[PDB]
């Protein structure tokens, strides 16, 4: 009985496991319950705090993955399996994980809280890419990750009702944040230095905790990688949530109370069966059950909240990857496959655009096409294919990010922006996808530091750099190495200079304006065009 | 006859002419100046199509330039050469239908290719007698026969009550067409080859050349065409019949006036009254818009130039087209607040948004927003130098560069051999401020070979450059090809095609080939903007 692996938290005792990181041991406490299982009558309901427990709770293993749609489009393929649940699905999934240095840190250590992505419809804190051992060992970071409910279970709302108020997945996250405030000192973490980081939907969640007052007292700094609370996919209005919920209810055989009670009688897989059948149009990068503008968790729309908010005492790190949009094209755009080169035609391109910008009117679609055509090579299939990718990435990720960065900087935040440009050598997606959504995570988490994983030596040094930026940022609100010179420095993003860095194998390079002309198009012009039907 | 120069007496269909032996740098040239080609369009003939000049008796003296057509005279900047060089240099008179011929001296033994110049001036001004149109250098140095004509401008040339008998519209175009007919019948008397006639013109002259390409009875009158910084398509070169009716009747009101009664009243008004009210009939505050221009009459112009270029067959057509680097800069000092020839014109964002409304006067609020959106540099959106240069670009692109790209593309796609250029050299003698770059009109002196005159203060490089340009133009007139057939040690000028969209830079350096004529931006003006006016 190793006394390093034995911790008393507020609800009783836990026993972790000593894990090996390539340069030393780490204490890991996996599968800690932070809420009552949200099962039976508790489905769709806010999480309640976990009741105290007798004896020593075994926390040496990852708990269950929250009930979710599983992707089976490319069965056996690593590029997809790596995001698939690696534990039993269950509605009983409200658990978090803590990695700390071994031995338990001497003084209060900065805490990183990871929030996974998965479109608010999938994900799990137990995936190998979210493995907190590397950061814990190399950097002395206390690293936390929680499961939160996804899909209908986490986000189905009948806004206004008491038994399905929506945003419960975000409340799961907030409760895990509360848990950290109350308990992380026991692990040698500093509750007074908590940095959220998250990718994609995880990023939008981090943004939503930024924009929701009760969350603000639970962390001090934030990192949003390839996603934002603003933009076309991260939220829906009360009306559209109600509509999708009633439609799903109809699709499975089902007054709010009665309707919600009926939905609670249904096996989990039944809800998931019809999850993907409530979307208002054929689309990509659009998701059925996502946080809802409820006037409660989100007091107004994200757009409204970032425009008017005060962000004085807040540091934020935001960024995107080089090819935010490639990935998604294969999941519903005619002409795209991971197996060939998807050299598309002009006509496939116009059709791709009605799918990538589902809300676009004919004129809007036209504007998009006309903006993204290379008029010197209007028929060239490589260009059209790359363009389709860019449309999807810009509209859903890069431009919402530029907008967020701009508003936070204007309204007092310290902001650092990046673009991630290194394609992992081990990647199994084709070359034409470049650096797809999500392929920076393994680098930030430190996976190349595991010799068994066959990353190059350059990649292993790259990873060490990123881990340093992220944890420096966690420590100080500033990603720059606070004792180092001639690097050069990563400058803050500002609305005037618009400086950001490229993250790749070469040293930091400062660039200005994040797709500045094209995001002017999405962020300023396109709204005007749509606000005429 | 008896004691005078035997090389200077020529007969044409209307009678006998005496010309003048003129000095060019490289030797003498024959000039026949102020040959009448129409009955003076005066009195009851104002607004009416031209009638051929009734034959005369005796020897007409053709040794001096004739009257300039009645027009507005720019007085914004007195003493200033930048404006003066374009102003009438002969008496203003409604009696102005005269043309000019320059030929080698002595006159060529075999039939020589003919270049016909059609001047610009927005359809409200111009003159074939300006120094920049002096045909002597092309005549002396390239052995060209050069012809230029006065045609009626402003109301006299373009006021229309479409449908009517007494003011049908497009009569200035008809003045031009008559001089083309005069060339067909009479040019061989000067050693010109009526079977090799190239039209060239600039700005409205270019638009004019374009209308002749698009109007059947003009087609048989020339073989090749050069359009410099102007097109018949685009937002300023034509008006709808309805709009010309609107402008003509408003003008009539302003001067105290069925169509017959109205026109008859207009005919009793002194010329100067018409000119004085000319600028008061435009629908909006604007630049690069002119009150009386060619009308889509369903006659001279059977349909809109856009319609006709989109659907026309241009099998047999060789066309050279281009633009200057800074088409827009000139116009900014006329009607855009914040702009001056006397300072750097560093404007504010607000003066930019205002400038765009004036420069794109036909734009809704959404359209103007689109223009502003597209031309803003989002890295430095408040930067006055950028905003100044974007304002120029907006005006240039919208009125000239994109219309030319549109023209070149449609013409190429439909059989034409099209050569394309961007002229990029600023005259060392330019008196406009440096910010204006290479403005509209400042290629002309080069193409006409003025730098060859030692007394003009051009640099040696400019003298050599002018000669190059004259060779391009006259090779093109000779052969339908600007390239020199022997000397292929020089870089070649490829045709412009829809596939490759090639054009060349004309500057002090040897030809450089570039691809895409503002391809992205012109996609905005030509493909997108129209649709934003259908919503």
Swiss-Prot record, chain B:
Xref: PANTHER family: ACETYLCHOLINESTERASE
Protein name: Acetylcholinesterase
Family the entry assigns: Belongs to the type-B carboxylesterase/lipase family.
Bilayer topology annotation: Peripheral membrane protein
Catalysis performed (reactions): acetylcholine + H2O = choline + acetate + H(+)
Glycan attachment positions: 258, 343, 457
Entry keyword annotation includes Disulfide bond: yes
Alphabetically ordered keywords of this record: Cell membrane, Disulfide bond, Glycoprotein, GPI-anchor, Hydrolase, Lipoprotein, Membrane, Neurotransmitter degradation, Secreted, Serine esterase, Signal, Synapse
CDD domains per UniProt: Esterase_lipase (cd00312)
Cysteines engaged in disulfide bonds, as pairs: 69-96, 257-265, 402-522
Gene source species: Mus musculus
């Amino acid at each position: 009985e190793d006394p390093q692996l034995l911790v008393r938290v507020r609800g009783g005792q836990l026993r972790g496991i000593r894990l090996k990181a390539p340069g030393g041991p780490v204490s890991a406490f996996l599968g800690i319950p932070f809420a009552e299982p949200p099962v039976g009558s508790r489905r769709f309901m806010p999480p309640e705090p976990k009741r105290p427990w007798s004896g020593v709770l075994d926390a040496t293993t990852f708990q269950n993955v929250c009930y979710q749609y599983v992707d089976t489009l490319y069965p056996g393929f690593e590029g997809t399996e790596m995001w698939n649940p690696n534990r039993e699905l269950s509605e009983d999934c409200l658990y978090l994980n803590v990695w700390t240095p071994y031995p338990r840190p001497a003084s209060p250590t900065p805490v990183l809280i990871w929030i996974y992505g998965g479109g608010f419809y999938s994900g799990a804190a137990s995936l190998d890419v979210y493995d907190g051992r590397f950061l814990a060992q190399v950097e002395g970071a206390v690293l936390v990750s929680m499961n939160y409910r996804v899909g209908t279970f986490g986000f189905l709302a009948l806004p206004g009702s008491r038994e399905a108020p929506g945003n419960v997945g975000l409340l799961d996250q907030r409760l895990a944040l509360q848990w950290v405030q109350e308990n992380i000192a026991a692990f040698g973490g500093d509750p007074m230095s908590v940095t959220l980081f998250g990718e994609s939907a995880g990023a939008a969640s981090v943004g939503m905790h930024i924009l929701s007052l009760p969350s603000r007292s639970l962390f001090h700094r934030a990192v949003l990688q390839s996603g934002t609370p603003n933009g076309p996919w991260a939220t829906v209005s009360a009306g559209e949530a109600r509509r999708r919920a009633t439609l799903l209810a109809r699709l499975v055989g089902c007054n709010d109370t009665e309707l919600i009670a009926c939905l609670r009688t249904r096996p989990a897989q039944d809800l998931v069966d019809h999850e993907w059948h409530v979307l208002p149009q054929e689309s990509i990068f659009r998701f059925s059950f996502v946080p809802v503008v409820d006037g409660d968790f989100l007091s107004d729309t994200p757009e409204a909240l970032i425009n008017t908010g005060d962000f004085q005492d807040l540091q934020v790190l935001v960024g995107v990857v080089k090819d935010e949009g490639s990935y998604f094209l294969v999941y519903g755009v005619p002409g795209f496959s991971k197996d060939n080169e998807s050299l598309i035609s002009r006509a496939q391109f116009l059709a791709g655009v009605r799918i990538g910008v589902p809300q676009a009117s004919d004129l809007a679609a036209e504007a998009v096409v006309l903006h993204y055509t290379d008029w010197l090579h209007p028929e060239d299939p490589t260009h059209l294919r790359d363009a389709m990718s860019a449309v999807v990435g810009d509209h859903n990720v890069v431009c919402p990010v530029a907008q967020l960065a701009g508003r936070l900087a204007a309204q007092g935040a310290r902001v650092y922006a990046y673009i991630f440009e290194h394609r992992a050598s081990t990647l199994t997606w084709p070359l034409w996808m470049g650096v797809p959504h999500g392929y920076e995570i393994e680098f930030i988490f430190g996976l190349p530091l595991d010799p068994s994983l066959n990353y190059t030596t350059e990649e292993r040094i790259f990873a060490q750099r990123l881990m340093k930026y992220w944890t420096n940022f966690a420590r100080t609100g500033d990603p720059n190495d606070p004792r180092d010179s001639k690097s050069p420095q990563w400058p803050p993003y500002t609305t005037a200079a618009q400086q950001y860095v490229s993250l790749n194998l070469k040293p930091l390079e400062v660039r200005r304006g994040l797709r500045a002309q094209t995001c002017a198009f999405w962020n300023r012009f396109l709204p005007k065009l749509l606000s005429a039907t």
